[PDB]
C-alpha cells in the first residue's frame, strides 16, 4: 500500500543473514518442511490445543527422524529382494519391524483409506 | 514494475509449475532417498501409503504431546514436553533410536548384540 519496504537483506552478512527475531529461523541446513502436515493433523487430534514455534522446530525434527528410521528398513528389505525401489511390500514390513503389531495394523488401515480417497494427506 | 503492477504477479515466480507451500514433490523425495542411499525409485501408490504412515505416526505423537500440554495447563505445547514427556514414551523412543546404546531388542544385524558366546582365545 503506499509506503513500501525501504531495506532489503541482500548484502554482506555478519551473523547468519543478520537475522534478529524478524524472519523464520533458518539454520542447521533445514530445508522445507512437514509443518503443513503436523499443523493439519494436530487440529484433527487436538483442536483446542496449539503449539509454540520452538516446539514445532523440534517436533518436525523428531517426527521426521521416525520416518527416516523406517526408511532404513525399507532399504534393508529391498536389499534382500536385490532391488532399489520402495513399494507397499517394504513399507508394510518396515512398519511391522519397528512399530508394534497392535499399532502397525492401524497404519495399514489408514494407508488403505488414503489410496481409496486418493488423497496424499488427511 | 516501476510504474505499478502492469501484469499479474502472484507467487514467487512465473511458471505454471509452481510449489505453493513447503511440500515435498516426488522429485525431491527421490533426491532425498538417493542422497541417503535408501532407494532410487518409488512404486506407484507407495507415496500415498508413505504419507498415511507419516500422518499416523504424527497423530500418535501429537496425541501424547497435546495431552501432556493440557496437564500442565498450557494452551500451546512447549519444548519442555518434547524433552520430557516425549522422551518418556518407549514406543516413540524406540523408533527415534538407531544402533547405539541398545534400548529395545530391535538391532538389525547378524546375531544378538551381546553375542551368544565368547570368542576363541589363543594360547
Curated annotation (Swiss-Prot), chain A:
Glycans are attached at residue 109. It holds the Pfam family Histone. CDD domains: HFD_H2B. One of its GO terms (cellular component) is nucleosome. One of its GO terms (biological process) is chromatin organization. The modification N6-succinyllysine is found at residues 43, 113, 117. SUPFAM superfamilies: Histone-fold (SSF47113). There is a cross-link at residue 117 (Glycyl lysine isopeptide (Lys-Gly) (interchain with G-Cter in ubiquitin)). GO terms for molecular function: DNA binding; protein heterodimerization activity; protein-containing complex binding; structural constituent of chromatin. Residues 1-29 are annotated as: Disordered. Phosphorylated by the catalytic component of the Dbf4-dependent kinase (DDK) complex Cdc7. Monoubiquitination of Lys-117 by Bre1 gives a specific tag for epigenetic transcriptional activation and is also prerequisite for histone H3 'Lys-4' and 'Lys-79' methylation. Deubiquitination of Lys-117 by the SAGA complex is involved in activating transcription of a large subset of genes. Keywords: Chromosome, DNA-binding, Glycoprotein, Isopeptide bond, Methylation, Nucleosome core, Nucleus, Ubl conjugation. It is found in: Nucleus; Chromosome. The modification N-methylproline is found at residue 1. Belongs to the histone H2B family. The nucleosome is a histone octamer containing two molecules each of H2A, H2B, H3 and H4 assembled in one H3-H4 heterotetramer and two H2A-H2B heterodimers. The octamer wraps approximately 147 bp of DNA. Core component of nucleosome. Nucleosomes wrap and compact DNA into chromatin, limiting DNA accessibility to the cellular machineries which require DNA as a template. Histones thereby play a central role in transcription regulation, DNA repair, DNA replication and chromosomal stability. DNA accessibility is regulated via a complex set of post-translational modifications of histones, also called histone code, and nucleosome remodeling. This is Histone H2B. It comes from Drosophila melanogaster. The gene is His2B.
Swiss-Prot record, chain B:
It comes from the Eukaryota. SUPFAM superfamilies: Histone-fold. The keyword Transmembrane does not apply. GO terms for molecular function: DNA binding; protein heterodimerization activity; structural constituent of chromatin. The modification Phosphoserine is found at residue 1. Residues 1-17 have a biased composition (Basic residues). GO terms for cellular component: chromosome; nucleosome; nucleus; polytene chromosome; polytene chromosome band. Belongs to the histone H2A family. This is Histone H2A.
Amino acid at each position: 500500500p503506499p509506503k513500501t519496504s525501504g531495506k532489503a537483506a541482500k548484502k554482506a552478512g555478519k551473523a547468519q543473514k543478520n537475522i534478529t527475531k524478524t524472519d523464520k529461523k533458518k539454520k542447521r541446513k533445514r530445508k522445507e518442511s512437514y509443518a503443513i502436515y503436523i499443523y493439519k493433523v494436530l487440529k484433527q487430534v487436538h483442536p483446542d490445543t496449539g503449539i509454540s514455534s520452538k516446539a514445532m522446530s523440534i517436533m518436525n525434527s523428531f517426527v521426521n527422524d521416525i520416518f527416516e528410521r523406517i526408511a532404513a528398513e525399507a532399504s534393508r528389505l529391498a536389499h534382500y529382494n536385490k532391488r532399489s525401489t520402495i513399494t507397499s511390500r517394504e513399507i508394510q514390513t518396515a512398519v511391522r519391524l519397528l512399530l508394534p503389531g497392535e499399532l502397525a495394523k492401524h497404519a495399514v488401515s489408514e494407508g488403505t483409506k488414503a489410496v481409496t480417497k486418493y488423497t496424499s494427506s488427511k | 514494475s516501476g510504474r505499478g503492477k502492469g501484469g499479474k504477479v502472484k507467487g514467487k515466480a512465473k511458471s505454471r509449475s509452481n510449489r505453493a507451500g513447503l511440500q515435498f514433490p516426488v522429485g525431491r523425495i527421490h533426491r532425498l532417498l538417493r542422497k541417503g542411499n535408501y532407494a532410487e525409485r518409488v512404486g506407484a501408490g507407495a507415496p500415498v501409503y508413505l504419507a498415511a504412515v507419516m500422518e499416523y505416526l504424527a497423530a500418535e505423537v501429537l496425541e501424547l504431546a497435546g495431552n501432556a500440554a493440557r496437564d500442565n495447563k498450557k494452551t500451546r505445547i512447549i519444548p519442555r514436553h518434547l524433552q520430557l514427556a516425549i522422551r518418556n514414551d518407549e514406543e516413540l523412543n524406540k523408533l527415534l533410536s538407531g544402533v547405539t546404546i541398545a534400548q529395545g531388542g530391535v538391532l538389525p544385524n547378524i546375531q544378538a548384540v551381546l553375542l551368544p558366546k565368547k570368542t576363541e582365545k589363543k594360547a
